[PDB]
Paper text:
SARS-CoV-2 is an enveloped positive-stranded RNA virus that depends on fusion of viral and target cell membranes to enter a host cell. This first key step of infection is catalyzed by the virus-encoded trimeric spike (S) protein, which is also a major surface antigen and thus an important target for development of diagnostics, vaccines, and therapeutics. The RBD can adopt two distinct conformations: “up” for a receptor-accessible state and “down” for a receptor-inaccessible state. We have previously identified two structural elements, the FPPR (fusion peptide proximal region) and the 630 loop, which appear to modulate the S protein stability as well as the RBD conformation and thus the receptor accessibility. In this study, we have characterized the full-length S proteins from the B.1.1.7 and B.1.351 variants and determined their structures by cryo–electron microscopy (cryo-EM), providing a structural basis for understanding the molecular mechanisms of the enhanced infectivity of B.1.1.7 and the immune evasion of B.1.351.
Author numbering:
A (entry chain A): 923 to 1162
B (entry chain A): 689 to 728
C (entry chain C): 729 to 1067
D (entry chain C): 1116 to 1162
The structure:
């Protein structure tokens, strides 16, 4: 688990050393603010129907009365160019806010905790996450358990043994085709079916697909070895 | 020998799952995965 | 999950086939590029929203031909071969119950001149330079992603979200669910025929409800109506004078000399350019709401379909067992199953 | 039962506790062993 983690942190380091486009989420947020400002500077070149775009050229080539008629155009056009920029920036700010509230929620639920939410803290079952800073953003390195090498087994919802029906306390029943075991749900580690591994409810007539196998009682060989102890002690007490 | 192709996009590789009323698959092993996620 | 992608040709809307008007429109600078860019940004985002909501699997899961799901009858929500697109029974109700104003699929003119032109308004939008663009994922590919999510859910539990699809019998998946809501798994097996008959009956109530009332899909129909009303309003503004002598660009040019015509034309340019900047601002604000709805739908796809949720009232009313996605026009329907 | 429950502390500290028996499944499993042992000891008086 340590070697797989250390190797996966190595793959992140090499991936970030190799491709450009992965940080496009942040670079696009820098590019949009830069493009919006480049556009707002370019609008200072528009005439808006005045005789010139250059404010000093209007004011130097015309007297007060017809100059107000030319300048009012440049004011009206430029003012709409600011209101367009500010409306666009309020709509982007509303997006960045939503992304920041998502990032605050992932900081709280993936870094300060562990999440049961599927695919929220990366793909796989969430173990933990590590935050990293980036220009205008946060990178989360999510660490996740992915189940990797499956085998098929035959399974049953229940075991019938002593006429009564048995169910796993935690995990699931499996068979290799010859013997039966409990195992935990998310990793194959088989164990003998026992009165500690299983709980009992009702008789085996009602459960669809129930199977016959023995359920072992771990107390039975404690008492039966204590019976062979008692039997040899009674047999010995015939001798003196 | 290179050009613009055009095609119907694939959604993903097809993978029918080996279901039965009595068959289960259980993982004998795991891989710790680290994945980067990037937020503005 | 999405809304109709729209491109508006700013020069053709403001200055339709007049170079006199086009040379005046150039004096307003980069505004038509800002408008084209903003609507392109929305249109790209409608595919992203649809990818985030539906494309949560890299593998396309196919259901077995035998339907031994422990008595649970998914035949209303799985695909049927009898229809030339792989939609479920319930999805073919959803695609009928929302009226879809312009899908964008080729206006060949034989459909858009003559008798139909006297009754169809979409051709007037198109002729004024307003065009609806098709989604990247058509209703067949959305039906296949939804089929794969549902096939994965009924065949493999939650595991296809975590990693490989691991088969499990459906009655054992439902037991793992029951343990998830704190009900002991013997309660499923001792009642399995009842739990199956109730699920089958509840899917029956969904089918009959969707067959009966209109208003339930208003969540999707009013997103179509808002985009349709916004474009009808944008077409209507070509009737406004804005204080010019005429609403009609050719009429102004038919009667006035160069020096006097420009004072009338630049009124229409100024009023129509406001009429676009209102439409594009309104569509960006709509796009910001549909985005939030697509992020919510992607979060419900991840937490209600690819999993089981402990979050109260997030995946339906009641304690969450599982949920089945179904495709709809511009949307997703979740069938949440709850104890 | 002792499988269905866990013990901590005495009965004085818990507000609203009730008296009832809690069954130990090991007790009658050993009590049939006491009756087995009793009949075996008494049978060993007969030969
Ligand atoms: C299903 O799981 C069973 C339990 O793991 C397994 O049975 C076990 O098989 C091993 C041999 O592979 C036996 O080990 C003994 O084998 C010989 C017996 O003479 C000895 O030389 C060895 O030292 C060792 O004691 C286990 O005893 C046996 N367990 C039982 C209860 O029979 C099955 O083989 C598995 N079946 C399949 C199809 O995989
Ligand atoms: C699982 O193990 C069970 C116990 O060994 C076994 O139950 C036994 O099944 C037989 C056949 O059904 C019953 O035999 C009786 O059948 C009818 C009356 O119901 C009569 O015609 C017969 O003469 C006979 O009385 C046994 O009574 C029954 N035992 C018990 C304790 O119920 C199951 O059949 C096994 N099932 C599998 C799938 O392995
Ligand atoms: C569970 O999956 C593990 C992989 O994530 C796997 O570990 C890998 O095991 C093999 C041997 O079985 C190792 O192979 C290398 O072994 C040495 C170098 O150490 C060389 O001589 C070989 O040629 C070969 O390169 C892998 O290095 C090893 N990987 C890791 C990260 O330890 C486990 O074996 C799997 N466990 C089970 C029970 O299946
Ligand atoms: C799973 O649920 C399905 C929906 O209830 C069900 O399909 C329905 O089956 C009935 C019975 O065949 C059909 O009723 C018609 O059946 C024949 C047709 O020739 C006539 O004799 C009857 O009068 C009646 O018209 C339903 O129409 C049919 N519904 C659909 C949408 O196909 C499946 O049979 C169920 N499968 C299982 C395994 O439970
Ligand atoms: C738990 O709630 C169940 C309802 O969700 C309830 O199931 C219903 O039980 C009644 C009988 O008690 C059945 O009534 C019908 O029975 C036959 C037709 O099959 C007719 O002769 C009757 O007139 C009547 O129509 C219902 O069909 C049945 N509903 C379902 C979905 O199976 C259980 O009885 C309740 N269980 C407990 C332990 O309270
Ligand atoms: C549940 O059962 C308990 C025992 O079966 C019982 O406790 C008993 O309570 C009485 C009265 O409080 C005690 O009697 C003693 O009272 C004082 C000393 O505290 C003396 O005057 C008496 O002579 C006598 O010693 C018992 O000693 C006490 N025994 C035990 C084992 O607790 C609880 O009261 C019962 N609970 C309820 C709610 O009734
Ligand atoms: C798990 O089982 C499936 C299919 O069931 C098995 O099919 C036989 C091969 C035999 O093992 C039966 O007793 C089982 O019922 C396996 O899926 C097959 O995989 C091969 C490639 O290995 C492929 O060519 C087949 O088309 C698949 N068949 C089906 C029905 O899907 C699967 O390989 C098994 N998993 C593992 C990890 O072994
Ligand atoms: C499983 O399906 C087979 C038919 O393919 C059937 O014979 C068997 O009885 C079924 N078992 C259960 C528990 O459904
Ligand atoms: C039998 O009991 C006597 C007690 O006097 C003891 O000496 C002897 O070792 C016992 N034998 C066995 C086999 O226990
Ligand atoms: C519960 O309330 C009643 C009065 O309504 C009181 O007599 C009783 O002692 C209370 N029991 C507990 C456990 O608080
Ligand atoms: C008593 O013990 C003897 C063996 O010493 C045996 O033959 C007899 O059947 C026993 N009786 C009982 C009731 O156990």
């Amino acid at each position: 688990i340590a070697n797989q983690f250390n190797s996966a942190i190595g793959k992140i380091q090499d991936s970030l050393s190799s491709t450009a486009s992965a940080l496009g989420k942040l670079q696009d947020v820098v590019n949009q603010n830069a493009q919006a400002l480049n556009t707002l500077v370019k609008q200072l070149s528009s005439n808006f129907g005045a005789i010139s775009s250059v404010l000093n050229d209007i004011l130097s080539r015309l007297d007060k009365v017809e100059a107000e008629v030319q300048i009012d155009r440049l004011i009206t056009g430029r003012l709409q160019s600011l209101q367009t920029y500010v409306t666009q920036q309020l709509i982007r700010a509303a997006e960045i806010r939503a992304s920041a509230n998502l990032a605050a929620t992932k900081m709280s639920e993936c870094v300060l905790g562990q999440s049961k939410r599927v695919d929220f803290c990366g793909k796989g079952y969430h173990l933990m996450s590590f935050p990293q800073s980036a220009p205008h953003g946060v990178v989360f390195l999510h660490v996740t358990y992915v189940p990797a090498q499956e085998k098929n087994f035959t399974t049953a919802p229940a075991i019938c043994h002593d006429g009564k029906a048995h169910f796993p306390r935690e995990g699931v029943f499996v068979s290799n085709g010859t013997h039966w075991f409990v195992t935990q749900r998310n990793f194959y580690e088989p164990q003998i079916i026992t009165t500690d591994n299983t709980f009992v409810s009702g008789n085996c007539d009602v459960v669809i697909g129930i199977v016959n196998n023995t359920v072992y009682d771990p107390l039975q060989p404690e008492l039966d070895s204590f019976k062979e102890e008692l039997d040899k002690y009674f047999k010995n007490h015939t001798s003196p | 020998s290179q050009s613009i192709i055009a095609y119907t996009m694939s959604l993903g590789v097809e993978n029918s799952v080996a279901y039965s009323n009595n068959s289960i698959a259980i993982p004998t092993n795991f891989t710790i995965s680290v994945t980067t996620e990037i937020l503005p | 999950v999405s809304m109709t992608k729209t491109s508006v040709d700013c020069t053709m809307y403001i200055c339709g086939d007049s170079t006199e008007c086009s040379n005046l429109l150039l004096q307003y600078g980069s505004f038509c590029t800002q408008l084209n860019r903003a609507l392109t940004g929305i249109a790209v985002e409608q595919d992203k929203n649809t990818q985030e909501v539906f494309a949560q699997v890299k593998q396309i899961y196919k259901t077995p031909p035998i339907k031994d799901f422990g008595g649970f009858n998914f035949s209303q929500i799985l695909p049927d071969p009898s229809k030339p697109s792989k939609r479920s029974f319930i999805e073919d109700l959803l695609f009928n119950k929302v009226t879809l104003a312009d899908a964008g699929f080729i206006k060949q003119y034989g459909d858009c001149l003559g008798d139909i032109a006297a009754r169809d308004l979409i051709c007037a939008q198109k002729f004024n330079g307003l065009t609806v663009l098709p989604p990247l994922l058509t209703d067949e590919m959305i039906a296949q992603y939804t089929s794969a999510l549902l096939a994965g859910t009924i065949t493999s539990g939650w595991t296809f979200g975590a990693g490989a699809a691991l088969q499990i019998p459906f009655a054992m998946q439902m037991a793992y669910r029951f343990n998830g809501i704190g009900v002991t798994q013997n309660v499923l097996y001792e009642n399995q025929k009842l739990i199956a008959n109730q699920f089958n009956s509840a899917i029956g109530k969904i089918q009959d409800s969707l067959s009966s009332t209109a208003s339930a899909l208003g969540k999707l129909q009013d997103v179509v109506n808002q985009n349709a009303q916004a474009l009808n309003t944008l077409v209507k503004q070509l009737s406004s004078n804005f204080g010019a002598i005429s609403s009609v660009l050719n009429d102004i040019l038919s009667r006035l000399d160069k020096v006097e015509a420009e004072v009338q034309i630049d009124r229409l340019i100024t009023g129509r350019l406001q009429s676009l900047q209102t439409y594009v601002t309104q569509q960006l604000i709509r796009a910001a709401e549909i985005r939030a709805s697509a992020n919510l739908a992607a979060t419900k796809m991840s937490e209600c379909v690819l999993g089981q949720s402990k979050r109260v009232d997030f995946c339906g009313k009641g304690y969450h067992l599982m949920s089945f996605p179904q495709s709809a026009p511009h949307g997703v329907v979740f069938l949440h199953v709850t104890y």
